[PDB]
């Protein structure tokens, strides 16, 4: 390729990390050459014209050029197996010259066009052997096979929804062409439904410091315990104050310790054991 390349470098060091180097350009040129320009794709049997530009970048030396289009059974031009289609044009110094070439693709597939040219007196030359895709006569399209909903729980009752899928008829598909079928599975999830909890922003009093006797200590520990349990399952500690939770855990643990000072061998230790109080202790604990 007669052009300017751009080299990109990337270093990956475990000491200096990643680093993208500045692009380095390399110009590759020649005093004389051919720029055979072929279209991306050419329709079979269709006669088209291809350009062949011959560049001459000599200081002050117009070149007597002899350009020839090599024969190829895949194409139909003036050049045959026993006949050479060669012109003899002249190119001014520091300029270019286009050379027309009529051809007709005969067989599909990646074919090959080749042109060569040499100058008289000067011992220079350059041939170009590029390849162009030869596509038949057709047009892109994406016919929709089918679009149905898949839900065994709803459609088809039973529990194992089945679905018959007809193939693509494509009655108008150009012979000798490929075609792919794509299956797409997509989940259509529908969330929602969760009645909000307490604002909490205006609920900063449940953090009561447990104190008192046996039952008085529980009444003060009740709000704090259930408060943390509620804020944990609602993750509302952000709007309430994260650095406030630590002050709550201490009050809960403090209430637990104070309640141990009233654990009979089984309110006041001097008093007979209560059935309800003991049962409630289990609930909170």
């Amino acid at each position: 390729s007669i052009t300017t390349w751009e080299i990109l470098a990337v270093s990956m060091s475990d000491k200096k990390g990643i680093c993208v180097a500045d692009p380095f350009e390399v110009t590759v040129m020649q005093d004389f050459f051919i720029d055979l320009r072929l279209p991306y794709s050419v329709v079979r049997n269709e006669q088209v014209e291809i350009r062949a530009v011959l560049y001459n970048y000599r200081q002050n030396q117009e070149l007597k050029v002899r350009v020839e289009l090599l024969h190829n059974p895949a194409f139909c031009s003036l050049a045959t197996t026993k006949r050479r289609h060669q012109q003899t044009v002249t190119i001014p110094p520091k300029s270019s010259l286009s050379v027309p070439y009529v051809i007709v693709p005969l067989k599909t597939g990646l074919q090959e066009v080749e042109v060569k040219a040499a100058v008289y007196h000067h011992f220079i030359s350059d041939g170009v052997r590029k390849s162009l895709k030869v596509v038949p006569e057709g047009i892109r399209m994406n016919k929709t096979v089918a679009v149905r909903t898949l839900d065994p729980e709803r459609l088809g009752r039973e529990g194992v929804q089945k679905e018959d899928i007809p193939p693509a008829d494509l009655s108008d598909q150009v012979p000798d062409t490929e075609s792919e079928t794509r299956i797409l599975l997509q989940g259509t999830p529908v969330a929602q439904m969760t009645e909000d909890a307490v604002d909490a922003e205006r609920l900063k009093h449940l953090i009561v410091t447990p104190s008192g006797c046996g039952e008085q200590n529980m009444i003060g520990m009740t709000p704090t315990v259930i408060a943390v349990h509620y804020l944990d399952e609602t993750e509302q500690w952000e709007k309430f104050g994260l650095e406030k939770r630590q002050g709550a855990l201490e009050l809960i643990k403090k209430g637990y310790t104070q309640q141990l000072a009233f654990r009979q061998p089984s309110a006041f230790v001097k008093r007979a054991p209560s059935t309800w109080l003991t049962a409630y202790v289990v609930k909170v604990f």
Partner: protein
């Protein structure tokens, strides 16, 4: 009164080493310190290790490097740091990020034809840009956002480089394709790079459209002058004819100007086209209205041989009343009452690129002036009064050759530093702002501000370094009684790149047996370049241009032990598409966006200075910072 403080990054990260600065003020002898981290809420013990002792030989400063494992919605998750200094325990809750690192996708070409193969590499690195071995999930979506291929390779022992390839079928939709990759440990964070698919053919020459000015003055009689430069890929000049047109853009909508269509010849590989102001105004139906909109040029060169054809386009030409723009995005929004406030004026051209050599000043003080450096930042400094009233500053460009009407102005508002209990104790950090380069040394100035009644109590400053979202370094700056200004010889290495912050604070007892903390932060920009170095030049230290098929030596100057991946592409390809490439500048742009700091420096109070710099302060006395529970920085509220 032994004061045990602790400082950690404002936002912690998973599978990465985050530093943690331990301390102990007015402490005697040694002190066993035990750092522990638990999940929130409850207790699961993500990390119990990492314990150290604060020795009086180190001014009682600790250093514990920890790492938070994985062991995996919409609501952020937090962790509870717990530092126990012997018996006294101090804990603080910090936000956690699911981002494990960055991913960079590189494709050989920018545009591909149906039938060819796409060669793409995935670079896997951490927050420190250092290579890492992880599991990566790579997908490829079509123009209509539909995945077609998905891989699951690992950069394990691959040196953070994942070479891949995919063949594009002949039967496929053309347009914009996308390659999306993400770490297996963070599905929410996805990186993507686009490559266009189109039936094309590499041209033989490029076309450049450069307007004389990188903008357009509404009151410019001459009009928008545009130059059409066309040259072959091999450098040689191009002879042909070009078709140039104009138009106005509005957000996403474009309005072509049929009466601006020109057909100028292209001699010597150059062309000249002009868009008269007459036609421009006639394009609409209030010149001051077009202000803000943009103009786009669309050229189309055709050789005199009619063999090849190229279409170029320049878009984004701003229509403004002023050749400049001023931004206070690099200037702290908080000043110290009665102390020199530094203004980092950021002058830039209408396009976005920094403006070099453009004098600026303040509303008053006609005498005060300052030119803009190569980075686009000017150095200004003003004296403030001991007033607790907000300071309003208006900076005005003073570039000659123009008029007071063509100048661009901008106004900001700085707020006084709220001191603890109105004790009027401040701390200012003035930095000699010049283009810092890895290897030089920086003179960090520490200016104290407090009555002599307690000035003898201050004997040291605690400074910390922020870099890429991690604590680079932290030390102490000695101070003797009677010194208001002390310099800190801070050597700049290759780590400070790109930008590094510097927070400094001191703590003492005064006023009325009340603990007080005063801090000040500053953000400095270092020259943006590769952490190391990588150069690629011609091996042949002589000769001219090669010939197709000829060999050539290719010298590569990089760091030792480093692996280098190469790729060569015909420039003709970039003529069709030059977007979505990979540049070192684009890398730093991403790293900077992932910064946890959201303020050029300073803050409303001591708890604000740390938070606005990406840090969290917590002491045994009670002085802590503002709770942060939001990933992204403050929503840019203009």
């Amino acid at each position: 009164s032994p004061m045990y403080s602790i400082i950690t990054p404002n936002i912690l990260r998973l599978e990465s080493e985050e530093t943690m600065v331990l301390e102990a003020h007015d402490a005697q002898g040694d002190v066993p310190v035990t750092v522990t981290v638990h999940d929130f809420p409850g207790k699961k013990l993500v990390l119990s290790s990492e314990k150290t002792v604060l020795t009086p030989a180190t001014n009682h400063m600790g250093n514990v490097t920890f790492t938070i494992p994985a062991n995996r919605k919409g609501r952020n998750k937090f962790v509870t740091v717990q530092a126990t200094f012997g018996t006294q325990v101090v804990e603080k809750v910090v936000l956690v990020s699911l981002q494990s690192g960055y991913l960079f996708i590189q494709t050989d070409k920018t545009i591909y034809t149906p039938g060819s193969t796409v060669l793409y590499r995935i670079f896997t690195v951490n927050h420190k840009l250092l290579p890492v071995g992880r599991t990566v999930m790579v997908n490829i979506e079509n123009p209509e956002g539909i995945p077609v291929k998905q891989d699951s390779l690992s950069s394990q022992n691959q040196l953070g480089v994942l070479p891949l390839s995919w063949d594009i079928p002949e039967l496929v939709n053309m347009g914009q394709w996308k390659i999306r990759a993400y770490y297996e440990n963070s599905p929410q964070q996805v990186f993507s790079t686009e490559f266009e698919v189109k039936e094309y053919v590499l041209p033989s020459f490029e076309v450049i459209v450069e307007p004389t000015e990188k903008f357009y003055y509404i009151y410019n009689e001459k009009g928008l002058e545009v130059t059409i430069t066309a040259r072959f890929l091999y450098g040689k000049k191009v002879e042909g004819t070009a078709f140039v047109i104009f138009g106005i853009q509005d957000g996403e909508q474009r309005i072509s100007l049929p009466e601006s269509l020109k057909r100028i010849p292209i001699e010597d590989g150059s062309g000249e086209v002009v868009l008269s102001r007459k036609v421009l105004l006639d394009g609409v139906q209030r010149a001051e209205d077009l202000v803000g909109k943009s103009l786009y040029v669309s050229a189309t060169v055709i050789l005199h041989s009619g063999s090849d054809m190229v279409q170029a386009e320049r878009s984004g030409i701003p229509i403004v009343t002023s050749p400049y723009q001023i931004h206070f995005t690099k200037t702290p929004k908080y000043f110290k009452p009665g102390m020199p406030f530094d203004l980092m004026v950021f002058v830039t051209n209408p396009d976005g690129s920094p403006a070099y050599r453009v004098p600026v000043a303040v509303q008053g003080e006609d005498t005060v002036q300052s030119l803009t450096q190569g980075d686009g930042v000017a150095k200004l400094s003003i004296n403030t009064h001991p007033s607790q009233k907000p300071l309003s500053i208006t900076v005005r460009t003073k570039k000659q050759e123009l008029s007071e009407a063509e100048q661009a102005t901008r106004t900001m508002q700085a707020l006084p530093y709220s001191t603890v209990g109105n004790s009027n104790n401040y701390l200012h950090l003035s930095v000699l702002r010049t283009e810092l380069r890895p290897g030089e040394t920086l003179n960090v100035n520490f200016l104290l501000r407090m009555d002599r009644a307690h000035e003898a109590k201050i004997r040291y400053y605690t400074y910390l370094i922020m870099n890429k979202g991690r604590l680079l370094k932290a030390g102490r700056q000695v101070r003797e009684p009677g010194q208001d200004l002390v310099v800190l010889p801070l050597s700049i290495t290759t780590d400070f790149i790109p930008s590094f912050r510097l927070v400094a604070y001191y703590t003492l007892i005064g006023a009325s047996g009340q603990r007080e903390v005063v801090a000040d932060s500053v953000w400095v920009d270092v020259k943006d370049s590769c952490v190391g170095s990588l150069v690629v030049k011609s091996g042949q230290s002589e000769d001219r241009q090669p010939v197709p098929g000829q060999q050539m030596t290719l010298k590569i100057e990089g760091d030792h032990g480093a692996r280098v991946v190469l790729v060569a592409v015909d420039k003709g390809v970039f003529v069709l598409n030059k977007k979505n490439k990979l540049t070192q500048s684009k890398i730093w742009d991403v790293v900077e966006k992932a910064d946890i700091g959201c303020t050029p420096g300073s803050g409303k109070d001591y708890a604000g200075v740390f938070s606005d710099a990406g840090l969290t302060f917590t002491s045994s006395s009670g002085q802590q910072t503002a709770q942060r529970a939001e990933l992204q920085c403050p929503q840019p509220a203009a």
